[PDB]
Design a protein around this ligand. Sequence first.
Ligand SMILES: Cc1n[nH]cc1-c1ccc(CCN)cc1
Lengths: 336, 20
Amino acid sequence: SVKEFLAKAKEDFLKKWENPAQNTAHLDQFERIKTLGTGSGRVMLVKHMETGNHYAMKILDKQKVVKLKQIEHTLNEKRILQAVNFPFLTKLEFSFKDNSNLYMVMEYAPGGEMFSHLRRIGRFSEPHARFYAAQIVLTFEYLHSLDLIYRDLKPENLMIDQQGYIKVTDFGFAKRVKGRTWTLCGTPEYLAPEIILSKGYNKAVDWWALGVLIYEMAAGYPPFFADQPIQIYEKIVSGKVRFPSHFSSDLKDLLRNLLQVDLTKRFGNLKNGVNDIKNHKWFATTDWIAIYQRKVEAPFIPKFKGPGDTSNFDDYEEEEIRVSINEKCGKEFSEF
Amino acid sequence: TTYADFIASGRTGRRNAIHD
Ligand SMILES: Cc1n[nH]cc1-c1ccc(CCN)cc1
């Protein structure tokens, strides 16, 4: 059963959650290759010299974290990621910190961001979109079972692996919470109405975000867009959404239910929970265990080149990894 | 078209997160 799987998963998670791994590597053990992404921190392709394995290494500047008031969120991110284990999550292999920076070393996904492939091709076919959506459904089922809310769903945070399956990455806003929370965080296009209206909110905001994602994947643009976030928020709270003429009746109905301003009627947040989504007609052809097992053929598979090939990633300016001779923010990140 | 309006918008690139 799923019940049976999730019960063991939670046992496994709980042990790691209460006794997090710490200081499992050092910077000098990795060769820095290429920056795969940057904002606020940055992610680099690196090579672990002792194995020759390639990984993606997230580097956070401790001082910058403090200034953005993201200390607790960063502590959440590392504690959660070292504890979880699921096929469609980027696995934390090592973590450490030095005088200046925090480091999280994860499994490398050479297929690049879904964002890149989605924007290029324009839009995905309903089957292509359904393939990805199912993996997000299963990942959220897993996360929510562990009382984890994710809060950062978008194509920019979904990596494609060499088999064409996805990895959900960026746990910067992930948090273990039973009951309601209040932090204003996320990405404008993906924010549930509760969040915009400074209400307390729960894991329903993740099922709403799934609605935005499926819509964007299938249409090629989000359901609520404008040049400024304010304008986007007005549309989200309006209570109106328009679907392209090419959207199937089943898709439109799924989305109306996921993109429901009314929490009592929003799929994923009803009495039956995630089964309302799983048993929808749009997922009728979905073999959920086959998705989990990865037996299903990927509708798109990234072009194989070398093991540390970066052509599915954009080019970013390469800045130094500077390490001060003085320890910064030791107290703040003691448990990291 | 809606597509045309999207592609002409300033929000077709990678979208930054927000926070207080
Ligand atoms: C964690 C990871 N594995 N392979 C690639 C990544 C990755 C690349 C870029 C970014 C920045 C945008 N989310 C995150 C993770």
